[PDB]
Chain A
Amino acid sequence: QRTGRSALAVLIRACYRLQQQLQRTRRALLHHSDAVLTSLHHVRMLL
């Protein structure tokens, strides 16, 4: 009982955290490129 039910816990923890790992990359890589766009935009302002 405790063998197979605890063996799947590693995979459960892996998948339910891989679901968040990519959400973080979704958020972290979009709040950073917007800064690049704003900077290019400001440089266009200077001219």
Chain B
Amino acid sequence: MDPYCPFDALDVWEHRRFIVADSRNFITPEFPRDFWMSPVFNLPRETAAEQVVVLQAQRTAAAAALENAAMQAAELPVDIERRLRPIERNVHEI
């Protein structure tokens, strides 16, 4: 698991003034690596398909209530013509 590197180590001392050819070192933490713990990404069990099932069941349940309300409100036009026509005839009797 060691990355390949031909060269071991080299040395020409670090005078703060004489910095030339500005490269950048690999910045590392001071803590032992063992707690830089492992990669884990876990799925939500509710799947893109499962939410489809749940929301479709909800849509189909709501459609029944919408149809119930429509059929409750679809009888009012029958009520108007069932209630007012006899009243119009009674007025006509005069």
Contacts and interface: CB of A to CB of B under 8 A. Distances in A.
A39 B84 CA distance: 25
A21 B87 contact: yes
Contacts, number: 48
Nearest to B73: A36
Interface residues of B, number: 20
Interface string B54-75: 0000100110011011001101
A12 B66 CA distance: 47
B62 A47 contact: yes
Interface of A: 11, 14, 17-18, 21-22, 24-25, 28-29, 32-33, 35-36, 39-40, 42-43, 46-47
